[PDB]
């Protein structure tokens, strides 16, 4: 299918206790492959997936220097932000960024992303056409104009449509044995009291990759959201994911229900009953 | 491959 590469960065200022802490992580689809932490001793970009271990010493220097530059860029962007919002030099603030690209199965560019957040709120974002910007407030509007006047979008689109795509494409080949692996959910069901009248049925999907999964409940072949609870998909820690879906049913009427599990790792969807 | 940061100034 199609694929993604994303980087997520987090700068947290701490006035009076040194420079902002900067953390960046890289992902390919659902698999994390690199990290940098400005508080950690190495001062290096580091591997977090086995397939990226193939990269030579110059790749690690190159990525190290680029992520440390981002570190510096966001250190300055925090100071600017403070002035824009006229905030005091006392408090901690957070500058977050996300960027990356998607490619189709052919390996061709599908979409690119380049966006900022300040204290948990959208700040500015590159629009889908990779040529224009969306500012979320008056402060961000200053930045938008700055970037439009300087035609900054072009350099960003160039990265997204080129370097980003070539990188993703490369990682996908180097790590095909895992990144292009499919891992089917292993399913089962639990059953719990709740009360005098009703029990809960929980449908489990375990050890599946990629995260993308659909779990739905049905009563007599008719689906139900009415008394349905669907938890966040969660990491198992071994590179695979877990998720469950639950319904509340009348006690003694459990066989009336079925759970349906769709996942691209499945020849055909699975159907479970208590 | 990390991007460069030219043009990223608020």
């Amino acid at each position, epitope marked *: 299918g199609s694929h993604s590469m994303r980087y997520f960065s987090t700068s947290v200022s701490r006035p009076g206790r040194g420079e902002p802490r900067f953390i960046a992580v890289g992902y390919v689809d659902d698999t994390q492959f690199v990290r940098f932490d400005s508080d950690a001793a190495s001062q290096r970009m580091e591997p977090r997936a086995p397939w990226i271990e193939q990269e030579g010493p110059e790749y690690w220097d*190159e990525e190290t220097g*680029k992520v*440390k*530059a981002h570190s*510096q860029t966001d250190r300055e962007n925090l100071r600017i932000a403070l002035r824009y919002y006229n905030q005091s030099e006392a408090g901690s603030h957070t500058l977050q960024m996300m960027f990356g690209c998607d490619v189709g199965s052919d390996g061709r560019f599908l979409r690119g992303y380049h966006q900022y957040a300040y204290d948990g709120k959208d700040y500015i974002a590159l629009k889908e056409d990779l040529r224009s910007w969306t500012a979320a407030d008056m402060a961000a509007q200053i930045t938008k104009r700055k970037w439009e006047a300087a035609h900054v979008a*072009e350099q960003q689109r160039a990265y997204l449509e080129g370097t980003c795509v070539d990188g993703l494409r490369r990682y996908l080949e180097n790590g095909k044995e895992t990144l292009q692996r499919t891992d089917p959910p292993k399913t089962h069901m639990t059953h719990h009291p709740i009360s005098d009248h009703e029990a809960t049925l929980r449908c489990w999907a375990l050890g599946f990759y990629p995260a993308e999964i659909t779990l739905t409940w049905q009563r007599d072949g008719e689906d139900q959201t009415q008394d349905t609870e669907l938890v966040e998909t969660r990491p198992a820690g071994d590179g695979t994911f877990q998720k469950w879906a639950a319904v509340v049913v009348p006690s003694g009427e459990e066989q009336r229900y079925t759970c349906h599990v769709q996942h691209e790792g499945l020849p055909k969807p699975l159907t479970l009953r208590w | 491959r990390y991007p*460069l940061t*030219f043009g990223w*100034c608020f």
Partner: T-cell receptor
Amino acid sequence: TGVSQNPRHKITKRGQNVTFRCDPISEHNRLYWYRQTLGQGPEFLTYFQNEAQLEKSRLLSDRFSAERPKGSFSTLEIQRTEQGDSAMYLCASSSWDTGELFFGEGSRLTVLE
Amino acid sequence: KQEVTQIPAALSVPEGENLVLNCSFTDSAIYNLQWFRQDPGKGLTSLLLIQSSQREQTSGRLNASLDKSSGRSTLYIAASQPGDSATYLCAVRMDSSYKLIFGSGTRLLVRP
């Protein structure tokens, strides 16, 4: 207006220490150091973003150190100069958006025995 | 292992000639390219900058083109004047680094 380097000329004796200064273009984001010998291209020494020295040439001598303590102006120091140090030392700075490098006049070093 | 070569190393021409100054690089993962002029004993004057996205750039009698796939960049000088006499430096920035990487230059003489 542009990049300002001092001293423009320096003649020294082998074993002596020299210091070169660069005053980049106002609020230019990055400052770069280069070295150039006769009829050759500039070779990279080191660079700063603000006051962070983020990349230095792996061939850079132990005797060479740079700093840009406030951002703004930068300092390049050579300890115990050798005739091989003799070269044109070039300072440049780039803007936040373009990355276009603008160079100073250069600081021309001759180390005599 | 990026190698920037400049073609040719030196050039003597009659005034008014249309000139081709070539620059090639072995690695095409280029962020941008920059052209410089250098006059003996002096520093570098910035002439043209071409970004990865852009294909050409012009300033008066100067036109620079760029072909990333080819690994090639040409600087055209129209109507060469004796005043163009200088060393012309080609430099590239990698996608992977902030520094500029220089060629050795083309030494140009335009004869009056």
